[PDB]
Amino acid sequence: LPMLQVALDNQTMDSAYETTRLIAEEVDIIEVGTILCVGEGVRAVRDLKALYPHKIVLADAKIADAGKILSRMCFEANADWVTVICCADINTAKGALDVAKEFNGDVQIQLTGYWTWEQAQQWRDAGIGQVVYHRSRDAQAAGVAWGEADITAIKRLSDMGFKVTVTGGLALEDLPLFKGIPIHVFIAGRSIRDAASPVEAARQFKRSIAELW
Amino acid sequence: SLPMLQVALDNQTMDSAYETTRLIAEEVDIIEVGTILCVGEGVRAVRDLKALYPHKIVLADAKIADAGKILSRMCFEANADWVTVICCADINTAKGALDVAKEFNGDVQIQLTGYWTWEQAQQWRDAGIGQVVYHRSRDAQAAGVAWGEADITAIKRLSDMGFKVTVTGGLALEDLPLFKGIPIHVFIAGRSIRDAASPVEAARQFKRSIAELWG
Ligand SMILES: O=P(O)(O)OC[C@H](O)[C@@H](O)C(O)NO
Ligand SMILES: O=P(O)(O)OC[C@H](O)[C@@H](O)C(O)NO
Numbered sequence: 296l297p298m299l300q301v302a303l304d305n306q307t308m309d310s311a312y313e314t315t316r317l318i319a320e321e322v323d324i325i326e327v328g329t330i331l332c333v334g335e336g337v338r339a340v341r342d343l344k345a346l347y348p349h350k351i352v353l354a355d356a357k358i359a360d361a362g363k364i365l366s367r368m369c370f371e372a373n374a375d376w377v378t379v380i381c382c383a384d385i386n387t388a389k390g391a392l393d394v395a396k397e398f399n400g401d402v403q404i405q406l407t408g409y410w411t412w413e414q415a416q417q418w419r420d421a422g423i424g425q426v427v428y429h430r431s432r433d434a435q436a437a438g439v440a441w442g443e444a445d446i447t448a449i450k451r452l453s454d455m456g457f458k459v460t461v462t463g464g465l466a467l468e469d470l471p472l473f474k475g476i477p478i479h480v481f482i483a484g485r486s487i488r489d490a491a492s493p494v495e496a497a498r499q500f501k502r503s504i505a506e507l508w
Numbered sequence: 509s510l511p512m513l514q515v516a517l518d519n520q521t522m523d524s525a526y527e528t529t530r531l532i533a534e535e536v537d538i539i540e541v542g543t544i545l546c547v548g549e550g551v552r553a554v555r556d557l558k559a560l561y562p563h564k565i566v567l568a569d570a571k572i573a574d575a576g577k578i579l580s581r582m583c584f585e586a587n588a589d590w591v592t593v594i595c596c597a598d599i600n601t602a603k604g605a606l607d608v609a610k611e612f613n614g615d616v617q618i619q620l621t622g623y624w625t626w627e628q629a630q631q632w633r634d635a636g637i638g639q640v641v642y643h644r645s646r647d648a649q650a651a652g653v654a655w656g657e658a659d660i661t662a663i664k665r666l667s668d669m670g671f672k673v674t675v676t677g678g679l680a681l682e683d684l685p686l687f688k689g690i691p692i693h694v695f696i697a698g699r700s701i702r703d704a705a706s707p708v709e710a711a712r713q714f715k716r717s718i719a720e721l722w723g
């Protein structure tokens with residue numbers, strides 16, 4: 296089954312803990328959001344992995360350059376996975392991946408904004424096994440909806456051999472769009488954190504995923 | 509005008525950054541909180557460095573990729589003057605960051621790290637972005653990528669489009685003459701200042717060379 300990931304897009308640890316204290320055990324992966332990485336720094340990764348060592352922790356650092364340096368910082372803070380932004384030089388993804396292997400972790404390419412199919416082939420040739428297909432929140436706010444072009448692109452990435460994560464303002468009702476595709480992870484940030492009942496929101500996601508896959 | 513000099517504080521902790529700034533804060537024009545320091549310490553790095561050096565321009569090199577308004581606002585509430593947005597970001601990300609920047613009488617630079625297109629550049633101009641950072645990736649550098657002709661051509665084209673262009677990426681003193689004759693807004697030096705035997709003298713050498721080349 297597709298795993299469920301909660302995005303902790305919080306500015307401070309105490310704000311993040313307001314969410315984790317409700318739903319840490321209701322999800323498979325705990326993401327330190329980019330907002331939290333910039334707010335608190337990599338202590339957020341160290342702290343959350345110490346709290347939830349049995350969970351996969353993702354540092355959503357969106358690394359753009361200095362792949363080995365920034366990756367090592369996250370992995371030394373005990374991240375399982377790190378993100379590299381899609382426009383990074385290929386050597387940045389390669390550098391992050393080399394460090395990830397030292398820690399038995401993994402690298403995901405975050406597909407936020409502009410990227411190309413040639414770049415996608417480079418990631419595959421470099422040994423990258425995970426991509427995050429992301430509808431940007433700012434695109435969403437400008438009226439961009441999930442659509443058939445997304446489903447097509449997601450299928451194409453899956454066929455290239457990537458494990459695909461899907462994210463970007465996902466609501467419970469969006470899940471059936473992706474049916475039949477071997478999605479690795481669905482991320483929910485707002486739709487879990489900001490729900491009247493975060494526990495219900497997480498359980499509904501898990502229920503629906505179980506129903507559909 | 510002479511190109512200004514910006515120090516990149518790509519340190520993992522505040523105390524390491526201060527080992528540099530206590531030497532060169534008054535020897536450079538712009539103090540950058542490097543992406544490595546934003547990730548190492550969080551946005552308190554911006555707040556603390558601006559409190560130390562409130563007369564200096566402080567750049568938060570956050571390389572914002574999405575959530576332009578939220579991430580911009582965090583940096584500006586920490587008293588940043590400038591923030592970076594990564595070149596692949598949705599155009600509405602750049603716009604959102606710029607909207608917030610205007611509230612704080614700050615500014616946004618697009619960081620040209622990695623892959624981007626001339627269509628995207630026209631979009632940034634049309635959105636009201638007035639600065640770009642032309643960057644040779646350190647990982648590209650380590651893979652043997654040198655500065656050269658194609659860079660000069662693109663930097664000129666960016667300047668002609670109306671951007672103030674910052675040049676950065678493993679710059680050494682010996683690289684500066686490649687850019688002579690171009691109205692460069694800022695040169696950034698991270699490693700070549702921080703890691704010098706004498707950071708003060710490294711900064712001063714950059715300043716002397718710049719004054720010779722653009723004087
Ligand atoms: O479900 P959302 O609130 O859209 O958050 C998930 C998304 O993937 C973010 O964490 C993110 O990385 N935005 O850039
Ligand atoms: O002079 P460097 O050590 O290359 O550092 C300057 C560069 O602009 C970095 O701060 C950076 O942003 N790298 O992505």
Ligand SMILES: [Mg+2]
Pocket residue numbers: 302326327328329355
């Ligand atoms: Mg995220």
Ligand SMILES: [Mg+2]
Pocket residue numbers: 516540542543569
């Ligand atoms: Mg920088």
